[PDB]
Every structure is written in C-alpha cells, then in structure tokens.
Amino acid sequence: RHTFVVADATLPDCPLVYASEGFYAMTGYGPDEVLGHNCRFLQGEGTDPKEVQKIRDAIKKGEACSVRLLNYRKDGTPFWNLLTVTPIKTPDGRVSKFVGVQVDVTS
Ligand SMILES: *[C@@]12=NC3=[C]C([C])=C([C])[C]=C3N([C][C]([O])[C]([O])[C]([O])[C]OP([O])([O])=O)C1=NC(=O)[N]C2=O
Numbered sequence: 001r002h003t004f005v006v007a008d009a010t011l012p013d014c015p016l017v018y019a020s021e022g023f024y025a026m027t028g029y030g031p032d033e034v035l036g037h038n039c040r041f042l043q044g045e046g047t048d049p050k051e052v053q054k055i056r057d058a059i060k061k062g063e064a065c066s067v068r069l070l071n072y073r074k075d076g077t078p079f080w081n082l083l084t085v086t087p088i089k090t091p092d093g094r095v096s097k098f099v100g101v102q103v104d105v106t107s
Pocket residue numbers: 005006007014038039040041042043052053055056059069071081083085086098099100102
C-alpha cells in the first residue's frame with residue numbers, strides 16, 4: 001500500500017502538481033489544499049530535523065533519497081511515512097520533476 005506524488009522542480013520550491021487517489025485519502029487533504037504547495041505541510045513537532053535535511057540536500061543536489069519521516073494527517077493524528085524521492089532529468093541533465101513514493105509504515 002503506497003501513494004505517489006509528482007513535484008515540479010522547474011519552480012524553485014518544488015510544489016506538488018499531481019497526487020494519487022491514495023495520497024489524499026491517506027493524509028486527509030484534498031487537491032484544493034495539496035496542489036501548488038510544497039509537501040512539507042505534512043510535517044510537525046515530532047518530525048526529525050536531521051531526516052528533513054537529508055531530503056533538502058538531495059533535492060538541491062538532484063539525487064534520490066529515502067527517509068523515514070513522522071507526518072501528520074489533516075485531523076492532526078500522526079503517522080510514519082517511508083518517503084522515497086527520485087529525480088527526473090531532461091536529456092541536458094537538468095532536473096525537471098521530483099517523484100515520490102510514500103508508504104505508511106506505522107504497521
Ligand atoms: C512528502 N513527499 C515528498 C515528495 C516529493 C516528490 C518531494 C520532492 C518531497 C516530498 N516531501 C518533502 C518536502 O517537499 C520538503 O522537500 C522537505 O520538507 C525538505 O525540504 P525543506 O526545505 O522543507 O527542509 C515530503 N515531506 C513530507 O513530510 N511528506 C511527504 O510525503
């Protein structure tokens with residue numbers, strides 16, 4: 001059971017431009033509150049800053065990255081999100097999109 005989102009890297013702050021049906025149902029947010037925004041709205045108090053940094057650097061360096069983050073639903077309840085971000089480049093080597101597979105690993 002996984003969800004899938006696409007982030008536009010041609011825009012500076014990598015806003016989300018497509019999310020799967022499961023992503024909305026897992027987090028409780030609608031497309032009116034997800035599209036056009038950065039995925040960081042899912043984070044909160046217990047989210048490890050050290051893990052968030054691993055993603056920030058991989059995006060700035062144009063690499064892939066797999067982290068385990070604590071995220072929060074719209075109702076504020078926490079869940080554990082195994083996140084894997086993958087860069088998508090053009091033939092000139094420039095990153096156009098970042099793609100993400102999110103898995104709820106709360107078991
Ligand atoms: C988020 N999923 C997600 C999916 C993709 C494709 C990308 C590129 C990032 C995420 N994030 C991270 C978020 O967008 C942001 O990059 C990070 O917060 C680190 O950058 P900053 O500048 O904020 O330090 C995801 N973050 C989540 O918490 N949950 C996901 O599903």
